[PDB]
Design a protein around this ligand. Structure first.
Ligand SMILES: CCCCCCCCCCCCCCCCCC(=O)OC[C@H](COP(=O)([O-])OCC(O)COP(=O)([O-])OC[C@@H](COC(=O)CCCCCCCCCCCCCCCCC)OC(=O)CCCCCCCCCCCCCCCCC)OC(=O)CCCCCCCCCCCCCCCCC
Ligand code: BCL
Ligand code: BCL
Ligand code: BCL
Ligand code: BCL
Ligand code: BCL
Ligand code: BCL
Ligand code: BCL
Ligand SMILES: CC[C@H]1c2cc3[nH]c4c(c3C)C(=O)[C@H](C(=O)OC)c4c3nc(cc4[nH]c(cc(n2)[C@@H]1C)c(C(C)=O)c4C)[C@@H](C)[C@@H]3CCC(=O)OC/C=C(\C)CCC[C@H](C)CCC[C@H](C)CCCC(C)C
Ligand SMILES: [Ca+2]
Ligand SMILES: [Ca+2]
Lengths: 44, 62, 259, 277, 41, 41, 50, 43, 42, 43, 42, 43, 43, 41, 38, 43, 34, 40, 49, 42, 44, 38
């Protein structure tokens, strides 16, 4: 029949590719923001 | 402007307008009663009580 | 025994926390009882997986419970499974959550406010086994209260004030003595159709029944009953749903918006 | 998702405003125009509540304890004007958001009623709850002459408001409209337990028994109190008791302060001073 | 009783075990850092 | 200019007019709450 | 724990368990952080260090 | 501009517009009364 | 023709609606002139 | 990223985003109005 | 996919969405630059 | 790990994920603003 | 002017009017009694 | 629409006007007497 | 609902709007003389 | 007494008994904690 | 047509923004806020 | 309860055996509790 | 008990696992909170180290 | 029968349920041994 | 004597008897704990 | 329900009640030894 979501290997692979790339860019900005925040005011 | 009565029921328009005007009149009369300056129920010869010797009508608050 | 359990804990604090555990358990029980109708859910999540994923949320479904109907009318399970049903409408837009536009004439579509399930094709029975909703012509000991106007002979008018017919008879509930339907003789083909009392606005002064739901011309397509002197649970829903569709389909202005 | 019998009811139309633009569903919810407006009214109001908690009464008293979070109305010295954001102005904006959210919720129910072709009893009944809220934060404060008479938005702080307003009349139990409202509330709770019990005891009969009929329901309470109101009328009665309780509660608070300033027991002096005794 | 075959049950378990182990790995590293920062016992 | 194929131009004007009026009210009330910019004094 | 620990996914739905564990861990993580912030010893935003 | 009355019903538009102007008029009068500097029912 | 009045019935209603309004407004103006003399507000 | 619109329909998304941005904009302005050091209407 | 849009029209929407979003971000960046000049927060 | 999208609906995941991140982002900013040590709007 | 009675039922508009005037008359007398300036039963 | 004829409405209006004038006549005299007793403005 | 009954409504609507705005301006000028707010 | 399961459902009885024992176990532990003589959590 | 309406929707905005700009210019003259 | 004597004898056998096991560790717990702090 | 495995013939060993896991978590939460309420076993406010 | 579980499945479930419960108890015993070393309560 | 169970249902009697006895036993223990003379958890 | 089951239940009920009363008597003897109430 199909998977639990109706997505094949290629569909899941394609979404995962964009998902991890967007998540990587989001985490990249987050890391830069926390570096700037640490320079502004260290918390630990 | 008879067009208004072509689209609005004369019985309902008069009931609504009469109720609106009566409600407006009651509201405005009360608005004058709220202000002691225009509170005619205090009497034509109304004179506020004179406070002397350190009297205060109200207790001190915030 | 003291009021203090520890330096900070006390009996009142334990009792309120004990209630929250019970209340959490109670809500789970109540939510489980809620899901005895209309579950498992119908979703694109299930449709796209080919029925592999059942949408029930949390808590999941309970075990089926049995309702033994009186007069051996069968046993009905509350968390049952119903056959798939096809709607008589098409989506306005393909995105999920979009509504549907009824096909053909909306009044006769059986969709939206005119939609109705297929109830059991047997009459609702009194405690003694007689049909409950019957016309006054067979409930002879039933009569209209003296101080109230007799609906028989009143004129039935539609949404637009046009005459639709006259009340030929009154259908009453035998178990609880109240009026349920007005049997209206349509003055277009002389065919008697039922008018639920919930869609009837009596005008005592003019002896007129006002039906805001549908037009006078719509009374010709009211669903009819197989037996003239009794109505099944299946037919009660069909009659009531047809009038309900009029509240949205009778006039173009009823679909909205106001502005 | 949707209920297994729900798809045949999801029809376009019946919207008061917006037409096809907002006529859709998000999960189980129907949104419509007032769902969009109601959501962002609620979203802004909630975010300003959190911000009000973030600044608190002041820096030292600021707390995120959900019991202690409180957004207070302005001082009475501001009258009916707008107050600074940290001096009650936040309460005024949240109140406006709350009114927008509640009315949008009621109007969204109207659109749902129109879609289903059912009566408008539910939005009508909800309007009484909205009206009671409007009396508390709009009508009574306006009659009293200050927005500071509204209750603060806090889980426990609005109880302190109720306590102190009650003792502004020295014994609030003697409020005649309060006594009538409580009678309806207590009667409603009694009527709700009776109705819930009767339906459950009939559809879930004794072990090895069939589902009872409407005759059993009528017979049961006739055997107990000698009268049965009927299957339809108990829902009229329950609606009437619940709405009457809220109506008389709205009366009881709007007469406390605007239309009565003495202690509530003193109001009964009209009865004690009758020349009959 | 879930519609999951034998292979998917093993396959899901394999990825689940790895994901749980990696999550537990990060948690342990975080608690080691937390312990160095401010021990609680 | 393609925004009108997803938004009905007749329903949008009502929502747009409702939005702008509500926004204009809020700004006036915010200015009234500010003693420096309260013109009714 | 025996070569048959994978049999659990024949009993419990993997998807519902994953949703339950993710929601539970997120709530638990929020709860523990909030508990620590509610203590003067482990409130890292108000200890004044550095 | 003149053909905009074919899309918006003039009866419902006028009813809504007058309801708006009335409520707006009450609001402005309410604001002026609430402000002691422009309350004409005093002094 | 939304209600049922023709071009003649509507014009007859409007004929005395204005007259009644004029009578109502005239008394209002007298009331405010007298109100101004008793206690001016502006 | 154009395939995000194959996941999120431009109908529900475009009006949700505008509402979220407007509430976010209001919230930040309210936050600044509530901060004495950044209240531009203080005078 | 699960929206009713194809890849061609979803791409067409994305172009207008991005260009509008870019113009919004540009005004925002200018706004914060002016806000920083008016009163820096860091 | 690409097979997680054969378990979870990508559309339902993104809405839940984006909604959580936005709430989490607001929560941390609010927490910082509630502490005078990290409130960047106080001066 | 006489045609107003073709619109309003004369029976209902007289019971409503007389009941309104009676309530209004009672209301005004009670208002004056509660006013010390116009209470005529204080002697 | 109510049922009253135009001629029959003339009969009611004539009695209504005279009766209304009579009621206003007593009302006016009552206020004139009240003003002579104790002016309220 | 045609142009014949849509152009008639516009003529009345604008005339009412201009008259409504005309006395509104007079009210504000009178209000400004009574107590200027700027 | 094996016949006691003719009238008591083994599934219903077992879960009810285990729930009964748990709350009794909680009740007795908490009663001991409330007693200063038997409170083992204090120093 | 999404182009004909856009020709008057945009045309209206410019008139509204122009009045808005005039109002803010006058407001700044009355009382600057920055 | 639709439970014949065939299946009501081994459920009872386990139930009694489990009850004895449960009562066995209860007694040990109370002996340890008594040694720690006698209540009589 | 010679045959304890027979318990799983009357209680579903799926909702039992969910109930056990939920029960143990709640009990574990309760005992930690009880110890936190104690001035002796509160490991976050005891000042050690 | 009652649970849809055969005699062989119940034997299978019980063996690993006992194994998992035994390992869970083992972690618990270690935790309490560490807790007793950290701060005894008796 | 054995004739009592003809009219009284043994299934309903047992559950009511067990519920009644447990409440009675719980009540008596609570009463004794309330009385300082018979409170065995006071340490004296 | 039947007549024959009545003596069957009664025999088990009596023995169970007798055993329950036996433990009760022992508990009260011990309770009397610990702290007599009369
Ligand atoms: C003591 C009194 C006080 C006690 C404390 C009370 C505290 C307040 C309680 C607040 C309860 C809020 C409930 C919100 C329901 C939201 C809708 C929903 O999903 O329901 C989930 C759930 C049922 O789930 P379901 O419908 O089976 O699942 C559908 C599928 O999962 C569908 O699958 P899915 O993938 O869509 O599932 C995702 C699901 C996930 O939902 C959750 O995570 C749970 C949410 C609640 C927690 O979220 C949604 O379904 C919505 C989709 C996203 C839309 C969200 C935004 C809507 C915008 C439009 C709004 C327009 C206006 O409903 C509830 O949990 C109700 C709880 C009721 C608690 C009552 C306690 C208070 C009253 C006590 C006194 C009464 C007498 C008691 C005796
Ligand atoms: C008070 C003195 C000590 C302390 C004394 C103890 C003692 C004594 C115990 C614990 C136990 C626990 N403590 Mg501790 N603990 C302290 C402070 C903490 C703090 C904190 C932030 O301060 C936290 C978050 C915890 C958290 C925990 C959990 C790891 C654990 C309870 C889990 C549970 O209920 O599973 C129940 C729910 C389940 C679903 C269990 C499932 C069992 C499965 C079948 C077995 C495999 C598990 C699988 C791999 C998933 C892992 C889950 C684990 C249970 C963690 N402790 C202080 C510092 N703590 C208990 C423990 O060791 O449990 C393991 C325990 O006996
Ligand atoms: C010392 C205090 C006094 C006292 C002082 C007051 C004061 C002051 C008040 C009352 C009011 C009430 N008192 Mg009293 N009262 C006292 C003692 C009592 C006793 C008692 C046993 O002694 C009782 C039974 C009552 C009962 C009552 C009720 C009649 C009434 C509250 C109900 C109500 O107003 O509904 C109204 C319901 C609402 C206002 C709810 C509004 C709902 C809104 C529209 C929806 C909100 C949606 C929400 C945000 C959703 C959240 C989303 C979630 C996810 C779900 N009082 C004592 C003697 N009492 C109140 C009243 O009458 O108000 C009208 C009131 O103000
Ligand atoms: C003493 C207080 C310390 C502190 C001590 C700790 C300790 C100790 C821990 C954390 C942990 C966390 N801290 Mg910290 N933390 C502090 C301050 C903060 C602040 C802040 C603004 O001050 C924030 C926002 C955080 C936030 C976080 C999160 C990153 C993390 C909890 C995530 C979670 O709940 O997962 C729950 C949600 C899920 C698990 C769903 C996600 C499921 C994913 C998809 C699993 C995929 C597996 C795959 C193989 C990839 C693995 C990668 C990892 C899972 C990351 N901390 C201060 C400085 N913090 C925990 C952690 O490290 O977790 C990683 C942790 O143990
Ligand atoms: C503060 C200084 C001055 C003052 C300064 C000003 C200024 C400046 C203005 C006014 C204006 C007004 N003032 Mg002033 N005014 C003052 C004191 C008062 C007092 C008082 C008792 O003190 C009163 C009663 C008023 C009353 C009025 C109104 C006559 C007028 C607002 C009309 C309006 O809002 O139209 C809106 C209402 C409608 C258009 C009708 C609403 C219809 C109903 C109510 C709604 C339902 C609609 C229905 C269902 C369908 C209708 C369809 C059609 C019938 C076909 N002012 C003080 C003394 N005032 C304004 C004006 O002049 O307007 C002409 C104005 O600009
Ligand atoms: C110490 C306090 C510092 C500060 C320190 C930090 C730190 C540290 C961080 C931030 C982060 C953020 N800060 Mg900051 N920040 C401060 C003051 C502010 C103020 C203000 C008015 O004072 C504002 C408005 C912000 C706002 C922001 C956001 C831009 C961002 C959190 C977004 C988010 O939660 O996404 C979650 C919500 C969503 C993801 C919803 C998404 C909606 C749409 C539909 C999805 C599109 C996805 C898209 C395709 C891909 C996303 C990533 C892209 C690569 C851009 N900060 C002060 C000065 N701030 C965080 C950040 O940088 O994240 C990027 C972060 O780590
Ligand atoms: C406060 C100063 C004065 C005072 C100032 C005024 C002023 C000013 C007025 C009154 C008026 C009235 N006063 Mg006074 N009045 C005072 C004290 C009193 C006291 C008292 C015990 O102290 C009493 C009992 C009254 C009583 C009255 C009523 C006679 C009258 C109220 C009429 C009404 O309500 O119409 C309700 C009744 C109806 C609407 C019935 C309608 C009848 C119509 C007109 C046709 C029927 C006519 C006839 C009755 C029957 C013939 C035809 C029939 C159909 C068969 N006054 C004090 C002393 N009083 C009012 C008045 O004079 O009205 C006439 C009035 O304007
Ligand atoms: C006050 C002095 C002591 C103390 C004195 C006592 C005394 C005396 C007793 C306990 C008992 C218990 N104590 Mg202690 N206990 C103390 C403090 C604690 C603390 C704590 C936070 O400090 C905890 C968590 C506990 C926990 C416990 C439980 C292990 C146990 C209650 C079981 C129960 O409620 O069954 C209710 C729940 C059920 C019955 C569910 C049924 C499921 C289980 C698995 C039944 C199995 C039956 C059988 C054994 C199966 C095995 C058969 C074979 C394998 C074939 N105690 C203090 C320190 N404690 C009781 C006990 O030992 O019981 C075993 C007991 O008599
Ligand atoms: C009038 C008879 C009774 C009644 C009826 C009633 N209530 C109703 C309805 C009806 C018929 C609905 O149809 C409607 C509903 O959807 O019910 C499920 C509703 C409802 N009654 C609710 C609550 C409620 N009703 C109450 C009372 C009553 N409701 C009466 C006793 C109370 C009380 C007594 O306290 C509460 C809390 C909701 C569950 C729901 C309406 C939901 C709603 O309006 O949603 C929009 C708002 C949000 C989603 C969030 C709030 C947004 C605000 C901006 C936040 C600020 C709120 C507030 C100003 C501050 C916080 C309050 C403090 C006191 C803590
Ligand atoms: Ca720090
Ligand atoms: Ca420590």
């Amino acid at each position: 029949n199909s998977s639990m979501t109706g997505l094949t290997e290629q569909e899941a692979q394609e979404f995962h590719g964009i998902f991890v790339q967007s998540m990587t860019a989001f985490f990249g900005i987050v890391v830069i923001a926390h570096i700037l925040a640490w320079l502004w005011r260290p918390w630990l | 402007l008879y067009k208004i009565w072509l689209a609005f029921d004369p019985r309902m328009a008069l009931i609504g307008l009469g109720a609106f005007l009566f409600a407006l009149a009651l509201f405005i009369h009360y608005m004058l009663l709220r202000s002691p300056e225009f509170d005619w129920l205090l009497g034509p010869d109304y004179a506020p009580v004179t406070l002397s010797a350190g009297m205060s009508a109200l207790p001190a608050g915030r | 025994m003291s009021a203090a359990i520890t330096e900070y804990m006390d009996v009142a604090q334990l009792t309120i926390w004990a209630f929250w555990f019970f209340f959490a358990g109670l809500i789970i029980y109540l939510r489980r009882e809620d899901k005895r109708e209309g579950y498992p859910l119908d979703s694109d999540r299930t449709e796209r997986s080919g029925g592999r994923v059942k949408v029930v949320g949390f808590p999941d479904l309970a075990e089926p419970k049995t309702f033994v109907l009186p007069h051996n009318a069968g046993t009905v399970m509350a968390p049952r499974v119903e056959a798939p049903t096809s709607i008589n409408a098409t989506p306005v837009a393909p995105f999920p959550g979009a509504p549907f536009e009824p096909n053909g004439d909306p009044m006769l579509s059986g969709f939206g406010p005119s939609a109705s399930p297929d109830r059991a094709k047997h009459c609702d029975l009194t405690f003694e086994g007689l049909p409950k909703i019957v016309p006054l012509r067979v409930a002879t000991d039933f009569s209209i209260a003296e101080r109230d106007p007799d609906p028989r002979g009143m004129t039935v008018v539609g949404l637009d004030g046009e005459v639709a017919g006259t009340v030929s008879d009154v259908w009453v509930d035998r178990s609880e003595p109240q009026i349920r339907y007005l049997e209206v003789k349509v003055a277009a083909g002389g065919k008697n159709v039922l008018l639920p009392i919930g869609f009837s606005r009596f005008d005592k002064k003019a002896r007129k029944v006002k039906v805001a739901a549908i037009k006078a011309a719509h009374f010709a397509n009211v669903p009819t009953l197989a037996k003239p002197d009794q109505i099944t649970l299946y037919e009660e829903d069909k009659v009531c749903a047809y009038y309900a569709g009029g509240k949205l389909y009778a006039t173009a202005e009823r679909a909205g918006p106001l502005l | 998702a949707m209920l297994s019998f729900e798809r045949k009811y999801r029809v376009r139309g019946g919207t008061l405003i917006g037409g096809d633009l907002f006529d859709f569903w998000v999960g189980p919810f129907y949104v419509g125009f007032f769902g969009v407006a109601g959501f962002f009214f609620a979203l802004l109001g909630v975010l300003l509540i959190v911000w009000g908690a973030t600044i608190g009464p002041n820096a030292e008293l600021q707390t995120y304890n959900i019991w202690q979070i409180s957004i207070a109305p302005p001082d009475l010295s501001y009258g009916l004007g707008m107050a600074p954001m940290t001096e009650g102005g936040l309460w005024q904006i949240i109140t406006i958001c709350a009114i927008g959210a509640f009315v949008s919720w009621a109007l969204r129910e109207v659109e749902i009623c129109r879609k289903l072709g059912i009566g408008f009893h539910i939005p009508f009944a909800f309007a009484f709850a909205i009206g009671a809220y409007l009396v508390l934060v709009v009508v009574r404060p306006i009659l009293m002459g200050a927005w500071g008479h509204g209750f603060p938005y806090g889980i426990l702080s609005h109880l302190d408001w109720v306590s102190n307003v009650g003792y502004q009349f020295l014994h609030f139990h003697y409020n005649p409209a309060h006594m009538l409202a409580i009678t309806f509330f207590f009667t409603n709770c009694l009527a709700l337990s009776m109705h819930g019990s009767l339906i459950l005891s009939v559809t879930n009969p004794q072990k090895g028994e069939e589902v009872k009929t409407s005759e059993h329901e009528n017979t049961f309470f006739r055997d107990i109190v000698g009268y049965s109101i009927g299957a339809l009328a108990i829902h009229r009665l329950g609606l009437f008791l619940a709405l009457s309780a809220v109506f008389w509660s709205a009366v009881c608070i709007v007469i406390s302060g605007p239309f009565w300033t003495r202690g509530w027991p003193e109001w009964w002096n009209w009865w004690l001073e009758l020349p009959l005794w | 009783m879930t519609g999951l075959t034998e292979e998917e049950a093993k396959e899901f378990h394999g990825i689940f075990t790895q994901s749980m182990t990696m999550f537990f790995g990060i948690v342990i590293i975080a608690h080691i850092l937390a312990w160095l920062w401010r021990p609680w016992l | 200019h393609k925004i009108w194929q997803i938004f009905d131009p007749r329903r949008t004007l009502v929502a747009l007019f409702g939005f702008l009026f509500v926004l204009g009210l809020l700004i006036h009330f915010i200015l009234l709450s500010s003693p420096a910019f309260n013109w009714l004094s | 724990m025996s070569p048959d620990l994978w049999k659990i996914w024949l009993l419990v739905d993997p998807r519902r368990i994953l949703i339950a564990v993710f929601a539970f861990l997120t709530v638990l993580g929020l709860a523990i952080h909030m508990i620590l912030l509610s203590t003067a010893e482990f409130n890292w935003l108000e200890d004044g260090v550095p």
